[PDB]
Each structure stands twice: as C-alpha cells, then as structure tokens.
Amino acid sequence: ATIGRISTGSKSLDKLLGGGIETQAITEVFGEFGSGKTQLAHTLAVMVQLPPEEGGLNGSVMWIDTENTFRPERIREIAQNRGLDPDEVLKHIAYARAFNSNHQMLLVQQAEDMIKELLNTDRPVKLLIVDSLTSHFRSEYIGRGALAERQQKLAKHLADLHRLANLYDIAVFVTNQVSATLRVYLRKGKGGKRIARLIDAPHLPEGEAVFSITEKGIED
Ligand SMILES: Nc1nc2ccccc2s1
C-alpha cells in the first residue's frame, strides 16, 4: 500500500513532515508539560477521520492512555470547530487505559484483533496512539539494575508497534519526554506559539515549524 499521510491541522507542521504523519511509520513526539504533544494527539484523532481531500484517511482510531491525558470533551470541541459531528468522531476512537508497562504491551499485542476486524470496512484503523510510550517503563524500572530489562521490553514494544504500522497500513503516533521512529521535539515559542523541530529524519531535512493551539486543536 502507498504511504498515506494525516494532516496535523498545521500547514507549517505538515510541510516540515513532508505532508503529515505517515502510515507504516511511528512518529514520536517529545515535549515537556504544555508543549502541545497531547493536543497534537487529540487533533490527529479528529483529522484522520476526514476524507483525503480534507487531510484525513477516512479512518478509525485506537488510543492507549498511560497517564489519563485523553479528554473526550476536547475531541468534541475540536470535532465541532472543524464542522464535524462530535458524537460520531468520539464513537470512532476506541479507548484503552494501560495500567502498567506489561498491560501496555499486552494491549498493543491484542490491538491486532480489532485492527483485523475493521481492516476491510468503511473505517479501518488508520491511527494508533500511545500516550505516552515510556511513562510506565520509567516508573517501574528504576536505576542501573533495571536498565537492561527496561530497554529490552521497550524495544520489543516498539517492534510490535512497527509491525502493526507496516502490516495494516496504520500511522502510529506516540508521545515521550526527554529509525526506529521519526522524532519531533516540541517546545514553547513566543507569545504562546509552539515550535516543532524535526531531528535525525533519514529522508526529511531537519527544520522547524511554528504552530498555534486553538479551539480547532492545532493549526498555523
Ligand atoms: N488491545 C487493544 N484494545 C484496545 C481498545 C481500544 C483502544 C486501544 C486498544 S488496544
């Protein structure tokens, strides 16, 4: 399948990314609290449900939440301000809380079942979010005695995600805090704007994009 792209809502950020976030890829977005990474997550969960002409892939979403940062009311707001139906948009976001790192890995392994079910329907899964990729791993595996196992499990987790992305033509989007992944770093700009910087992309030049957070989620 040809690589599909989902608009982030921001034309500036889309340009930096070569058009939007890619299917068959993991996009990994870093940022401190208030950087805009979870807002970008929420915006993508809406955008992907649009037709390609509007920057989406006519897709469903699966959302794995590790620290209780998913906000249904924010989905509704973004959906409505983009002229969409907030109830329909929310219905097509499948939600799962991950309680710990083992559970998080289990959820990704078993996510394949639902992806298979939706694969040849009108709303195949096109976005899988893990927000956030590392909070549980960082919490559970403390100090140098734990590092080896931590990296092992995380590596396996990322491999499971890459496989789902590649096999089923899904854009995987994960958040983190400071290949395999396309790494984007968010920071505060001036006047409440945010800045994204792309780093170490094999086939996209490094660069920066300034964007805003609005009732539409993110946009220029
Ligand atoms: N195994 C998984 N089931 C679900 C359900 C909703 C969202 C994400 C996931 S991952």
CA distance 70 to 90: 11
189 C-alpha to center of ligand 1: Å?
35
Phi, psi of 54 (to 5 degrees): -105, 5
Q: Is the CB of 63 under 6 A from ligand 1?
A: yes
Q: Is the CB of 92 under 6 A from ligand 1?
A: no
- Atom 1 of ligand 1 has which residue's CA nearest to it? 111
Q: Please tell me the experimental approach by which this structure was elucidated.
A: X-ray
CA distance 145 to 131: 26
Whether the CB-CB separation of 106 and 153 falls below 8 Å is answered with no
User: Residue-wise over 97-118: b if at least 16 C-beta within 10 A, else e?
Assistant: ebeebeebbebbeebeeebeeb
* Total number of domains constituting the chain: 1
Q: Which residue type occupies 220? A: D
Whether the CB-CB separation of 94 and 62 falls below 8 Å is answered with yes
**Atom of ligand 1 lying closest to residue 110 CA:** 1
Q: Is 27 annotated as a binding residue?
A: no
Task: Identify the helix (H) or strand (E) that includes residue 113.
Answer: helix 101-118
CA distance 217 to 188: 16
**Sign of the Cα pseudo-torsion (66, 72, 74, 76, in order):** positive
Q: Is the peptide bond before 132 cis (omega within 30 degrees of 0)?
A: yes
CA distance 123 to 60: 5
Sheet strands side by side (includes 25-30): 93-97, 60-65, 125-131, 171-176, 25-30, 182-188, 194-199, 207-214, 217-219
Q: Which residue type occupies 179? A: S
**Atom of ligand 1 lying closest to residue 109 CA:** 1
Q: Any idea what the CATH number is for the domain that residue 176 is in?
A: 3.40.50.300
Q: Residue 172 sits in which domain range?
A: 1-220
CA distance 44 to 75: 10
3-state secondary structure at position 28: strand
127 C-alpha to center of ligand 1: Å?
12
Q: Which two structure tokens, joined as six digits, stand for 106?
A: 């289990």
Q: Which of 201, 220, 170, 218 is nearest to 36 (CA)?
A: 218
Q: Which two structure tokens, joined as six digits, stand for 165?
A: 């992305």
